[PDB]
N, CA and C atoms as an extended XYZ file, in Angstrom:
567
Properties=species:S:1:pos:R:3:atomname:S:1:resname:S:1:resid:I:1 pbc="F F F"
N        28.585      -15.540       -7.371 N   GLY     1
C        28.099      -14.005       -6.894 CA  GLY     1
C        27.215      -13.310       -8.381 C   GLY     1
N        26.102      -12.893       -7.811 N   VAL     2
C        25.460      -12.177       -8.647 CA  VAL     2
C        25.366      -10.743       -8.510 C   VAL     2
N        26.032      -10.069       -7.529 N   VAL     3
C        26.125       -8.470       -7.425 CA  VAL     3
C        27.864       -7.885       -7.429 C   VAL     3
N        27.522       -7.017       -8.088 N   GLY     4
C        29.479       -6.478       -8.191 CA  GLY     4
C        29.410       -5.186       -7.869 C   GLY     4
N        30.873       -4.790       -7.837 N   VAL     5
C        31.075       -3.000       -7.680 CA  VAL     5
C        32.273       -2.957       -8.705 C   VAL     5
N        31.727       -1.654       -9.478 N   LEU     6
C        32.890       -1.639      -10.388 CA  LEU     6
C        34.383       -1.011       -9.447 C   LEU     6
N        35.362       -1.802      -10.211 N   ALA     7
C        36.280       -1.171       -9.140 CA  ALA     7
C        37.520       -1.046      -10.040 C   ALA     7
N        37.041       -0.290      -10.926 N   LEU     8
C        38.462        0.445      -11.564 CA  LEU     8
C        39.123        1.546      -11.332 C   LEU     8
N        38.659        2.407      -10.243 N   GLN     9
C        39.145        3.532       -9.507 CA  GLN     9
C        38.066        3.701       -8.383 C   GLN     9
N        38.690        4.269       -7.108 N   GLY    10
C        37.796        4.917       -6.180 CA  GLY    10
C        37.144        4.064       -4.926 C   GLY    10
N        36.438        4.182       -4.548 N   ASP    11
C        35.952        3.449       -3.226 CA  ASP    11
C        34.814        2.759       -3.389 C   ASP    11
N        35.235        1.529       -4.239 N   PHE    12
C        34.641        0.528       -4.374 CA  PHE    12
C        34.225       -0.459       -2.912 C   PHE    12
N        35.792        0.006       -1.901 N   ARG    13
C        35.675       -0.935       -0.538 CA  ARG    13
C        34.750       -0.795        0.427 C   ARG    13
N        34.160        0.563        0.483 N   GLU    14
C        32.822        0.916        1.394 CA  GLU    14
C        31.891       -0.136        0.733 C   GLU    14
N        31.362        0.116       -0.300 N   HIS    15
C        30.393       -0.561       -0.876 CA  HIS    15
C        30.309       -2.116       -0.983 C   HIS    15
N        31.487       -2.816       -0.753 N   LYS    16
C        32.105       -4.204       -0.587 CA  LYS    16
C        31.570       -4.152        0.955 C   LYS    16
N        31.905       -3.730        1.723 N   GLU    17
C        31.632       -3.779        3.082 CA  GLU    17
C        30.412       -3.500        3.412 C   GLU    17
N        29.519       -2.378        3.039 N   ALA    18
C        27.895       -2.274        3.008 CA  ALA    18
C        26.997       -3.622        2.768 C   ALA    18
N        27.894       -4.037        1.480 N   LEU    19
C        27.120       -5.302        1.146 CA  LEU    19
C        26.982       -6.624        1.863 C   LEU    19
N        28.011       -6.824        2.726 N   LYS    20
C        28.328       -7.618        3.512 CA  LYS    20
C        27.103       -7.889        4.354 C   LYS    20
N        26.761       -6.534        4.528 N   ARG    21
C        25.544       -6.739        6.200 CA  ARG    21
C        24.401       -7.235        5.348 C   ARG    21
N        24.523       -7.523        4.110 N   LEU    22
C        23.006       -8.036        3.170 CA  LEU    22
C        23.517       -9.732        3.239 C   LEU    22
N        24.711       -9.962        3.517 N   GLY    23
C        25.230      -11.356        3.299 CA  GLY    23
C        25.731      -11.635        1.866 C   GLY    23
N        25.981      -10.476        1.459 N   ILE    24
C        26.715      -10.467        0.029 CA  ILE    24
C        28.203      -10.537       -0.484 C   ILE    24
N        28.609      -11.511       -1.054 N   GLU    25
C        30.311      -11.119       -0.984 CA  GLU    25
C        30.165      -10.701       -2.930 C   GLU    25
N        30.345       -8.997       -2.551 N   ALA    26
C        30.496       -8.734       -3.831 CA  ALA    26
C        31.857       -8.538       -4.772 C   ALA    26
N        31.567       -8.926       -5.946 N   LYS    27
C        32.516       -9.231       -6.962 CA  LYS    27
C        33.092       -7.949       -7.426 C   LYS    27
N        34.280       -7.987       -7.778 N   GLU    28
C        34.624       -6.379       -7.842 CA  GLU    28
C        35.144       -6.773       -9.552 C   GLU    28
N        34.557       -5.841       -9.994 N   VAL    29
C        34.453       -5.790      -11.565 CA  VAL    29
C        35.717       -4.673      -12.589 C   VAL    29
N        36.452       -5.186      -12.719 N   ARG    30
C        37.533       -4.974      -13.506 CA  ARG    30
C        38.034       -5.007      -15.021 C   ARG    30
N        37.168       -6.048      -15.343 N   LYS    31
C        37.109       -6.538      -16.827 CA  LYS    31
C        35.480       -6.698      -17.174 C   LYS    31
N        35.411       -6.515      -18.354 N   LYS    32
C        34.357       -6.996      -19.313 CA  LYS    32
C        33.523       -8.011      -18.961 C   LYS    32
N        34.245       -9.222      -18.896 N   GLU    33
C        34.136      -10.733      -18.830 CA  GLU    33
C        33.578      -10.420      -16.888 C   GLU    33
N        33.870       -9.683      -16.034 N   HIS    34
C        33.566       -9.693      -15.175 CA  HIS    34
C        31.932       -9.449      -14.639 C   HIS    34
N        31.143       -8.914      -15.790 N   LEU    35
C        29.892       -8.543      -16.052 CA  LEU    35
C        28.835      -10.196      -15.965 C   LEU    35
N        29.358      -10.982      -16.759 N   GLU    36
C        28.718      -12.014      -16.731 CA  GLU    36
C        28.144      -12.828      -15.470 C   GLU    36
N        26.746      -13.329      -15.739 N   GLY    37
C        26.487      -13.601      -14.270 CA  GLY    37
C        25.538      -13.063      -13.295 C   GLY    37
N        25.779      -10.949      -13.506 N   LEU    38
C        25.548      -10.310      -12.502 CA  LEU    38
C        24.184       -9.674      -12.801 C   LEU    38
N        23.727       -9.429      -11.743 N   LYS    39
C        22.173       -9.091      -11.664 CA  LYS    39
C        21.853       -7.826      -11.272 C   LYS    39
N        23.373       -7.076      -10.496 N   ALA    40
C        23.131       -5.787      -10.086 CA  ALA    40
C        24.561       -5.383      -10.347 C   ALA    40
N        25.030       -4.197      -10.352 N   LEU    41
C        26.170       -3.455      -10.381 CA  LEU    41
C        26.056       -2.241       -9.940 C   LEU    41
N        27.013       -2.093       -8.925 N   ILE    42
C        27.550       -0.682       -8.191 CA  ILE    42
C        28.340        0.037       -8.698 C   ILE    42
N        28.306        1.355       -9.142 N   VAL    43
C        29.333        1.932       -9.673 CA  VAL    43
C        29.543        3.011       -8.594 C   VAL    43
N        30.770        2.836       -7.381 N   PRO    44
C        31.020        3.685       -6.439 CA  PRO    44
C        31.331        5.328       -6.645 C   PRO    44
N        31.312        5.458       -5.315 N   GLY    45
C        31.970        7.159       -5.311 CA  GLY    45
C        33.268        7.275       -5.990 C   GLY    45
N        34.091        8.583       -6.327 N   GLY    46
C        35.253        8.449       -6.495 CA  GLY    46
C        35.354        9.609       -7.681 C   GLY    46
N        36.907        9.303       -8.712 N   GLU    47
C        36.849       10.316       -9.316 CA  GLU    47
C        36.256        9.952      -10.612 C   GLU    47
N        35.110       10.601      -11.056 N   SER    48
C        34.042       10.608      -12.608 CA  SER    48
C        35.059       10.072      -13.644 C   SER    48
N        35.689       11.548      -13.761 N   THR    49
C        36.529       11.212      -15.031 CA  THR    49
C        37.281       10.340      -15.217 C   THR    49
N        37.711        9.880      -14.245 N   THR    50
C        38.677        8.601      -14.298 CA  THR    50
C        38.070        7.433      -14.586 C   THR    50
N        37.087        7.163      -13.401 N   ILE    51
C        36.285        5.500      -13.767 CA  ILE    51
C        35.142        5.629      -15.419 C   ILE    51
N        35.294        7.083      -15.651 N   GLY    52
C        34.573        7.144      -17.234 CA  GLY    52
C        35.242        6.332      -17.878 C   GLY    52
N        36.837        7.390      -18.213 N   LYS    53
C        37.360        6.839      -19.356 CA  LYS    53
C        37.709        5.900      -19.057 C   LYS    53
N        38.552        5.048      -17.939 N   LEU    54
C        38.626        3.274      -17.751 CA  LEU    54
C        37.521        2.560      -18.411 C   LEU    54
N        36.174        2.854      -17.600 N   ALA    55
C        35.418        2.030      -18.373 CA  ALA    55
C        34.758        1.837      -19.731 C   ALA    55
N        35.118        3.104      -20.134 N   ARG    56
C        34.913        3.260      -21.678 CA  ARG    56
C        36.278        2.234      -22.725 C   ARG    56
N        37.298        2.524      -21.828 N   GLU    57
C        38.768        2.022      -22.766 CA  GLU    57
C        38.540        0.614      -22.632 C   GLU    57
N        37.900       -0.299      -21.647 N   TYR    58
C        38.112       -1.362      -21.302 CA  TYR    58
C        36.760       -2.210      -21.999 C   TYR    58
N        36.036       -1.474      -22.493 N   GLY    59
C        34.820       -1.946      -22.994 CA  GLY    59
C        33.399       -2.505      -22.367 C   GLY    59
N        33.830       -1.732      -20.519 N   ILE    60
C        32.666       -2.289      -19.746 CA  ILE    60
C        31.208       -1.156      -20.130 C   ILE    60
N        31.615       -0.067      -20.327 N   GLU    61
C        30.749        0.931      -20.580 CA  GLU    61
C        29.865        0.297      -21.598 C   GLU    61
N        30.113       -0.002      -23.064 N   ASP    62
C        29.258       -0.400      -24.129 CA  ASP    62
C        28.593       -1.788      -23.596 C   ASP    62
N        29.179       -2.665      -23.025 N   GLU    63
C        28.522       -4.292      -22.480 CA  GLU    63
C        27.198       -3.579      -21.538 C   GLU    63
N        28.007       -2.653      -20.318 N   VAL    64
C        26.816       -2.051      -19.417 CA  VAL    64
C        25.666       -1.521      -20.160 C   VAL    64
N        25.849       -0.771      -21.000 N   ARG    65
C        24.481       -0.218      -21.939 CA  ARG    65
C        23.875       -1.371      -22.363 C   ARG    65
N        24.349       -2.194      -23.017 N   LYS    66
C        23.726       -3.517      -23.730 CA  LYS    66
C        22.910       -4.134      -22.672 C   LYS    66
N        23.681       -4.608      -21.449 N   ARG    67
C        22.786       -5.306      -20.424 CA  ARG    67
C        21.686       -4.428      -19.798 C   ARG    67
N        21.946       -3.209      -19.981 N   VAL    68
C        20.726       -2.551      -19.335 CA  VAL    68
C        19.506       -2.495      -20.089 C   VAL    68
N        20.068       -1.892      -21.339 N   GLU    69
C        19.022       -1.966      -22.750 CA  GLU    69
C        18.144       -3.251      -22.770 C   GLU    69
N        18.836       -4.188      -22.164 N   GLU    70
C        18.292       -5.642      -22.421 CA  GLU    70
C        17.270       -6.014      -20.858 C   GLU    70
N        17.592       -5.405      -20.135 N   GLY    71
C        17.088       -5.108      -18.544 CA  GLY    71
C        17.517       -6.510      -18.028 C   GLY    71
N        18.675       -7.273      -17.833 N   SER    72
C        19.221       -8.114      -17.573 CA  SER    72
C        20.901       -7.845      -16.490 C   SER    72
N        20.536       -6.309      -16.297 N   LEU    73
C        21.579       -5.924      -15.374 CA  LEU    73
C        20.808       -4.249      -14.434 C   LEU    73
N        20.465       -4.259      -13.180 N   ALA    74
C        20.156       -3.444      -12.579 CA  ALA    74
C        21.704       -2.283      -11.872 C   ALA    74
N        21.589       -1.081      -12.037 N   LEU    75
C        22.591       -0.355      -11.643 CA  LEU    75
C        22.208        0.573      -10.326 C   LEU    75
N        22.956        0.944       -9.499 N   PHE    76
C        23.034        1.906       -8.679 CA  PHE    76
C        24.677        2.973       -8.890 C   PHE    76
N        24.606        4.140       -8.852 N   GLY    77
C        25.738        4.813       -8.960 CA  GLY    77
C        25.467        5.959       -7.964 C   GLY    77
N        26.768        5.863       -7.014 N   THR    78
C        26.703        6.848       -6.105 CA  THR    78
C        27.696        7.994       -6.186 C   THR    78
N        27.226        8.939       -6.154 N   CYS    79
C        28.180       10.027       -6.372 CA  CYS    79
C        28.549       10.246       -7.671 C   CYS    79
N        30.143        9.696       -7.931 N   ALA    80
C        30.964        9.797       -9.085 CA  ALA    80
C        30.072        8.855      -10.159 C   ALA    80
N        29.425        7.374       -9.487 N   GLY    81
C        28.660        6.503       -9.763 CA  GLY    81
C        27.196        7.249      -10.847 C   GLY    81
N        26.589        8.451      -10.184 N   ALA    82
C        25.581        8.653      -10.222 CA  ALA    82
C        25.862        9.725      -11.536 C   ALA    82
N        26.956       10.484      -11.412 N   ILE    83
C        27.564       11.209      -12.762 CA  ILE    83
C        27.703       10.558      -13.849 C   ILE    83
N        28.531        9.016      -13.592 N   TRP    84
C        28.572        8.143      -14.880 CA  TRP    84
C        27.284        7.921      -15.074 C   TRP    84
N        26.343        7.565      -14.844 N   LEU    85
C        24.854        7.132      -15.097 CA  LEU    85
C        24.029        8.469      -16.113 C   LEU    85
N        24.771        9.665      -15.685 N   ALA    86
C        24.047       10.914      -16.258 CA  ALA    86
C        23.881       11.142      -17.845 C   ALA    86
N        22.952       11.183      -18.358 N   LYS    87
C        23.234       11.677      -19.884 CA  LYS    87
C        23.969       12.726      -20.301 C   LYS    87
N        23.685       13.847      -19.434 N   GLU    88
C        24.120       15.289      -19.178 CA  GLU    88
C        25.053       15.539      -18.475 C   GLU    88
N        26.393       16.089      -18.377 N   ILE    89
C        26.889       16.387      -17.211 CA  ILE    89
C        27.094       18.089      -17.596 C   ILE    89
N        26.525       18.751      -17.021 N   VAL    90
C        26.940       20.305      -16.894 CA  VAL    90
C        28.269       20.466      -17.064 C   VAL    90
N        28.540       21.208      -18.080 N   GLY    91
C        29.713       21.479      -18.340 CA  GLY    91
C        31.098       21.060      -18.865 C   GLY    91
N        30.781       19.458      -18.936 N   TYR    92
C        31.429       18.557      -19.744 CA  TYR    92
C        30.698       17.430      -20.590 C   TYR    92
N        30.210       18.281      -21.517 N   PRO    93
C        29.188       17.335      -22.723 CA  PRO    93
C        30.089       16.024      -23.055 C   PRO    93
N        31.744       16.088      -23.147 N   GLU    94
C        32.334       15.526      -23.711 CA  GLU    94
C        32.873       14.069      -22.486 C   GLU    94
N        32.223       14.292      -21.195 N   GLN    95
C        32.960       13.570      -20.542 CA  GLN    95
C        32.851       12.094      -20.786 C   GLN    95
N        33.378       11.247      -20.621 N   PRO    96
C        33.054        9.485      -20.880 CA  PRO    96
C        32.178        9.095      -19.893 C   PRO    96
N        31.066        8.676      -20.196 N   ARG    97
C        30.279        7.853      -19.284 CA  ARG    97
C        28.853        7.256      -20.145 C   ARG    97
N        28.328        6.637      -19.092 N   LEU    98
C        27.046        5.746      -19.604 CA  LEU    98
C        26.316        6.326      -20.353 C   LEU    98
N        25.493        7.671      -19.570 N   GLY    99
C        24.452        8.241      -19.927 CA  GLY    99
C        23.212        7.316      -20.161 C   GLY    99
N        22.907        6.527      -19.261 N   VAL   100
C        21.636        5.948      -19.853 CA  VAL   100
C        20.577        6.766      -18.828 C   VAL   100
N        20.908        7.456      -17.863 N   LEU   101
C        19.962        7.987      -16.721 CA  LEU   101
C        19.571        9.356      -17.310 C   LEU   101
N        18.134        9.663      -17.618 N   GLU   102
C        18.066       10.969      -18.530 CA  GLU   102
C        17.540       12.383      -17.124 C   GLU   102
N        18.759       12.593      -17.102 N   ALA   103
C        19.448       13.514      -16.154 CA  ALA   103
C        20.444       14.379      -16.501 C   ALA   103
N        20.367       15.785      -16.040 N   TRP   104
C        21.451       16.547      -16.070 CA  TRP   104
C        22.305       16.834      -14.792 C   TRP   104
N        23.512       16.659      -14.494 N   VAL   105
C        23.855       16.668      -13.525 CA  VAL   105
C        25.258       17.370      -13.336 C   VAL   105
N        25.416       18.331      -12.193 N   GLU   106
C        26.561       19.188      -12.602 CA  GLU   106
C        27.627       18.604      -11.352 C   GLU   106
N        28.821       18.385      -11.488 N   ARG   107
C        29.635       17.954      -10.664 CA  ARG   107
C        29.992       18.984       -9.696 C   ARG   107
N        29.903       18.858       -8.258 N   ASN   108
C        30.268       19.255       -7.065 CA  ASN   108
C        29.920       20.857       -7.251 C   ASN   108
N        28.381       21.076       -7.139 N   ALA   109
C        27.901       21.614       -7.674 CA  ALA   109
C        27.137       22.990       -5.996 C   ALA   109
N        27.045       22.291       -5.110 N   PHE   110
C        26.175       22.420       -3.969 CA  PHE   110
C        26.692       24.083       -3.369 C   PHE   110
N        27.729       24.404       -3.880 N   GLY   111
C        27.921       26.001       -3.131 CA  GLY   111
C        28.209       26.081       -2.034 C   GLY   111
N        28.365       25.273       -0.943 N   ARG   112
C        28.997       25.163        0.320 CA  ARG   112
C        30.736       25.322        0.933 C   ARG   112
N        31.172       26.001        1.196 N   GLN   113
C        32.658       26.804        1.808 CA  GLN   113
C        32.614       24.934        1.994 C   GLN   113
N        32.411       24.426        2.932 N   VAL   114
C        33.175       23.133        3.509 CA  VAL   114
C        32.432       22.220        2.522 C   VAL   114
N        33.061       21.001        2.198 N   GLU   115
C        32.735       20.525        0.653 CA  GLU   115
C        32.197       18.952        1.473 C   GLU   115
N        31.791       19.008        2.160 N   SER   116
C        31.261       17.938        3.226 CA  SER   116
C        29.956       18.219        4.502 C   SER   116
N        29.138       17.455        4.234 N   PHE   117
C        27.741       17.468        4.903 CA  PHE   117
C        27.168       16.302        5.037 C   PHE   117
N        26.617       16.366        6.263 N   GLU   118
C        25.408       15.200        6.440 CA  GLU   118
C        23.626       15.970        6.900 C   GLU   118
N        23.042       14.980        6.168 N   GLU   119
C        21.356       15.380        6.047 CA  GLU   119
C        20.949       14.312        6.450 C   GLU   119
N        19.554       14.298        7.388 N   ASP   120
C        18.804       12.904        7.432 CA  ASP   120
C        17.902       13.195        6.400 C   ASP   120
N        17.675       12.380        5.833 N   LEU   121
C        16.906       12.244        4.427 CA  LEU   121
C        15.405       11.017        4.625 C   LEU   121
N        14.223       11.603        4.074 N   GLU   122
C        13.148       11.020        3.755 CA  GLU   122
C        13.150        9.926        2.331 C   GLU   122
N        12.879        8.871        2.633 N   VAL   123
C        13.336        7.904        1.287 CA  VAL   123
C        11.988        7.386        1.343 C   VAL   123
N        11.230        7.255       -0.007 N   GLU   124
C         9.948        7.111       -0.084 CA  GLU   124
C        10.156        5.679       -0.287 C   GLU   124
N         9.501        4.843        0.720 N   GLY   125
C         9.194        3.438        1.018 CA  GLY   125
C        10.156        3.206        1.996 C   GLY   125
N        11.315        3.580        1.658 N   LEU   126
C        12.296        2.905        3.020 CA  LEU   126
C        11.986        4.047        4.205 C   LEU   126
N        11.823        5.001        4.328 N   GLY   127
C        11.907        5.627        5.323 CA  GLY   127
C        13.196        6.652        5.344 C   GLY   127
N        13.611        7.132        7.027 N   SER   128
C        14.455        7.927        7.143 CA  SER   128
C        15.822        7.383        6.976 C   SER   128
N        16.719        8.142        6.222 N   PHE   129
C        18.108        7.672        6.019 CA  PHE   129
C        19.102        8.657        6.197 C   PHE   129
N        20.669        8.583        6.733 N   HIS   130
C        20.955        9.226        7.156 CA  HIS   130
C        22.214        9.636        5.572 C   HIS   130
N        22.135       10.946        5.005 N   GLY   131
C        22.749       11.198        4.153 CA  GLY   131
C        24.228       11.731        4.270 C   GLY   131
N        25.259       11.181        3.144 N   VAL   132
C        26.661       11.508        3.843 CA  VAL   132
C        26.902       12.183        2.386 C   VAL   132
N        27.388       13.509        2.312 N   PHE   133
C        27.607       14.317        1.438 CA  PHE   133
C        29.172       14.817        1.318 C   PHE   133
N        29.961       14.301        0.008 N   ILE   134
C        30.987       14.845       -0.053 CA  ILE   134
C        31.482       15.357       -1.728 C   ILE   134
N        31.476       16.445       -1.606 N   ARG   135
C        31.758       17.389       -2.890 CA  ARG   135
C        30.484       16.818       -3.869 C   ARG   135
N        29.341       16.581       -3.022 N   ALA   136
C        28.492       15.991       -3.799 CA  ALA   136
C        27.829       16.931       -5.354 C   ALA   136
N        27.445       16.251       -6.103 N   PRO   137
C        27.193       16.653       -7.293 CA  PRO   137
C        25.501       17.065       -7.228 C   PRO   137
N        25.219       17.537       -8.284 N   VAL   138
C        23.781       18.138       -8.255 CA  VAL   138
C        23.094       17.865       -9.265 C   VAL   138
N        21.752       17.245       -8.980 N   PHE   139
C        20.616       16.635      -10.271 CA  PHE   139
C        20.233       18.271      -10.293 C   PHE   139
N        20.642       18.531      -11.789 N   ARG   140
C        20.041       19.735      -12.442 CA  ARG   140
C        18.241       19.692      -12.838 C   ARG   140
N        18.418       18.715      -13.642 N   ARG   141
C        17.309       18.832      -14.528 CA  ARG   141
C        16.904       16.952      -14.772 C   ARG   141
N        15.514       16.608      -14.579 N   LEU   142
C        15.144       15.260      -14.748 CA  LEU   142
C        14.022       15.141      -15.489 C   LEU   142
N        14.657       13.639      -16.655 N   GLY   143
C        13.291       13.391      -17.583 CA  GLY   143
C        12.233       13.448      -17.097 C   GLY   143
N        10.962       12.853      -17.527 N   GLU   144
C         9.796       12.652      -17.431 CA  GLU   144
C         9.534       11.300      -16.954 C   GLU   144
N        10.567       10.396      -17.141 N   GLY   145
C        10.292        8.725      -17.078 CA  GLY   145
C        11.077        8.690      -15.332 C   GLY   145
N        11.558        9.623      -14.849 N   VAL   146
C        12.506        9.705      -13.456 CA  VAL   146
C        12.001        9.885      -12.291 C   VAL   146
N        11.972        9.008      -11.366 N   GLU   147
C        10.887        9.127      -10.220 CA  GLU   147
C        12.365        9.596       -9.177 C   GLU   147
N        11.468       10.809       -8.215 N   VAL   148
C        12.664       11.074       -6.970 CA  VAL   148
C        12.433       10.460       -5.748 C   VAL   148
N        13.249        9.737       -5.289 N   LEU   149
C        12.720        9.224       -4.524 CA  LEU   149
C        13.010        9.627       -2.802 C   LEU   149
N        13.922       10.471       -3.377 N   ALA   150
C        14.497       11.393       -1.577 CA  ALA   150
C        14.974       13.043       -2.264 C   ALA   150
N        14.789       13.942       -1.293 N   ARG   151
C        15.232       15.384       -1.651 CA  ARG   151
C        15.504       15.600       -0.026 C   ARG   151
N        16.737       16.764       -0.497 N   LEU   152
C        17.253       17.542        0.461 CA  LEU   152
C        16.246       18.757        0.361 C   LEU   152
N        15.592       19.056        1.260 N   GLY   153
C        14.418       20.164        0.821 CA  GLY   153
C        13.798       20.017       -0.087 C   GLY   153
N        14.332       20.355       -1.253 N   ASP   154
C        13.021       20.148       -2.411 CA  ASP   154
C        14.038       20.030       -3.683 C   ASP   154
N        15.318       19.584       -3.244 N   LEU   155
C        16.680       18.903       -4.280 CA  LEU   155
C        16.771       17.807       -4.462 C   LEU   155
N        16.176       17.305       -5.598 N   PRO   156
C        16.247       15.421       -5.760 CA  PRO   156
C        17.886       15.154       -5.320 C   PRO   156
N        17.909       13.882       -4.607 N   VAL   157
C        19.199       13.631       -3.854 CA  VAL   157
C        18.995       12.078       -4.334 C   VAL   157
N        18.170       11.206       -4.755 N   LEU   158
C        17.889       10.304       -4.747 CA  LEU   158
C        16.799        9.678       -5.674 C   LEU   158
N        17.549        9.241       -7.259 N   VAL   159
C        16.299        9.109       -8.150 CA  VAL   159
C        16.455        7.896       -8.788 C   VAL   159
N        14.961        7.484       -9.548 N   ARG   160
C        15.474        6.332      -10.274 CA  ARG   160
C        14.658        6.103      -11.445 C   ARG   160
N        15.322        5.101      -12.089 N   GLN   161
C        14.578        5.154      -13.623 CA  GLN   161
C        14.421        3.413      -13.818 C   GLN   161
N        13.597        3.062      -13.659 N   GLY   162
C        13.449        1.519      -13.759 CA  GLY   162
C        14.518        0.870      -12.989 C   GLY   162
N        15.362        0.490      -13.689 N   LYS   163
C        16.296       -0.010      -12.804 CA  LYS   163
C        17.606        0.126      -12.506 C   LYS   163
N        17.462        1.460      -12.842 N   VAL   164
C        18.690        2.344      -12.762 CA  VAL   164
C        18.744        2.983      -11.493 C   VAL   164
N        19.226        3.205      -10.324 N   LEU   165
C        19.104        3.787       -9.015 CA  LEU   165
C        20.490        4.837       -9.218 C   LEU   165
N        19.890        5.803       -8.798 N   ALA   166
C        21.248        7.238       -8.593 CA  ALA   166
C        21.268        8.216       -7.004 C   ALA   166
N        22.479        8.374       -6.381 N   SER   167
C        22.289        9.006       -5.337 CA  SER   167
C        23.253       10.134       -5.162 C   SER   167
N        23.228       11.554       -5.126 N   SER   168
C        24.692       12.221       -4.646 CA  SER   168
C        25.035       12.053       -3.365 C   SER   168
N        24.440       11.489       -2.817 N   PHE   169
C        25.098       10.936       -1.308 CA  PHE   169
C        25.740        9.478       -1.306 C   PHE   169
N        26.469        9.259       -0.130 N   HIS   170
C        26.997        8.140        0.079 CA  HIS   170
C        25.958        7.273        1.001 C   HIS   170
N        25.335        6.328        0.686 N   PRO   171
C        24.784        5.159        1.760 CA  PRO   171
C        25.885        4.436        1.850 C   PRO   171
N        27.136        4.174        1.544 N   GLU   172
C        28.023        3.011        2.107 CA  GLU   172
C        28.860        3.701        2.822 C   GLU   172
N        28.772        4.742        3.524 N   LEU   173
C        29.638        5.558        4.358 CA  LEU   173
C        28.648        5.795        5.680 C   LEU   173
N        27.554        4.821        5.608 N   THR   174
C        26.919        4.422        6.976 CA  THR   174
C        26.800        3.064        7.553 C   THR   174
N        26.257        2.786        8.183 N   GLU   175
C        26.341        1.174        8.251 CA  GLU   175
C        24.401        0.898        8.136 C   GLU   175
N        24.267        1.872        7.578 N   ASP   176
C        22.686        1.244        7.121 CA  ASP   176
C        22.344        0.771        5.926 C   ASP   176
N        22.402       -0.621        5.901 N   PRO   177
C        22.383       -1.500        4.648 CA  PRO   177
C        21.040       -1.291        3.600 C   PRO   177
N        19.954       -0.490        4.464 N   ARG   178
C        18.567       -0.591        3.886 CA  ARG   178
C        18.545        0.031        2.309 C   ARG   178
N        19.261        0.916        1.634 N   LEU   179
C        19.297        1.378        0.520 CA  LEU   179
C        19.968        0.568       -0.493 C   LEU   179
N        20.847       -0.500       -0.021 N   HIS   180
C        21.364       -1.286       -0.665 CA  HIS   180
C        20.460       -2.165       -0.798 C   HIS   180
N        19.626       -2.627        0.237 N   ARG   181
C        18.780       -4.126        0.244 CA  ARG   181
C        17.682       -3.544       -0.895 C   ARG   181
N        17.343       -2.006       -0.844 N   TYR   182
C        16.253       -1.275       -1.365 CA  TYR   182
C        16.886       -1.542       -3.091 C   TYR   182
N        18.384       -1.605       -3.491 N   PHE   183
C        18.567       -1.493       -4.632 CA  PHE   183
C        18.605       -3.024       -5.058 C   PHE   183
N        18.673       -4.173       -4.427 N   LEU   184
C        18.844       -5.564       -4.606 CA  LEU   184
C        17.635       -6.141       -4.706 C   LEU   184
N        16.455       -5.389       -4.415 N   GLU   185
C        15.214       -6.101       -4.539 CA  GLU   185
C        14.688       -5.393       -5.291 C   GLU   185
N        15.138       -4.330       -5.982 N   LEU   186
C        14.693       -3.824       -7.270 CA  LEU   186
C        15.513       -4.649       -8.469 C   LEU   186
N        16.510       -5.310       -8.130 N   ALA   187
C        17.211       -6.016       -9.002 CA  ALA   187
C        17.087       -7.494       -9.205 C   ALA   187
N        15.957       -7.533       -8.035 N   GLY   188
C        15.596       -9.008       -8.216 CA  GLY   188
C        16.439      -10.221       -7.838 C   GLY   188
N        17.579       -9.624       -6.762 N   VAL   189
C        18.622      -10.598       -6.021 CA  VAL   189
C        17.851      -11.424       -5.116 C   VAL   189
């Protein structure tokens, strides 16, 4: 298996199920050793402060940083995973995270009474994709080398920086595997 889903905490189950539609049997990553042999790693939705704390404690954060830097590992972060990837988390400068993505992300900042909504999104190259948002974080600022692949109105919700992909929505909460395939393709799987 060359595709893994970080399984320290959260909803990795949904991503494994989504990956099955691509004929992939996802490897559950719980130890740094589990990163060996992977071409792609998905960081799931969940509790961002916990995923960050555990990934740091187990040495996974540092190894992932090294792997991405050498270009031997593609990353796809969804919700908590997108927060984990962000270089800056608004209001939580010291929150444990990878921080490779040049972006400023604010946790659960959409400002809607009901903290859950769904929107049809236009994804560059992919087409229309059903976006599922739950206590969704907001991409406040993006670095110059970051590409916006999808927006809700004018707000970026799917961004890419090289082999790092991040979404504020949950593609794994739909039965559409096209965004996952898009990720595997860029990871060279």
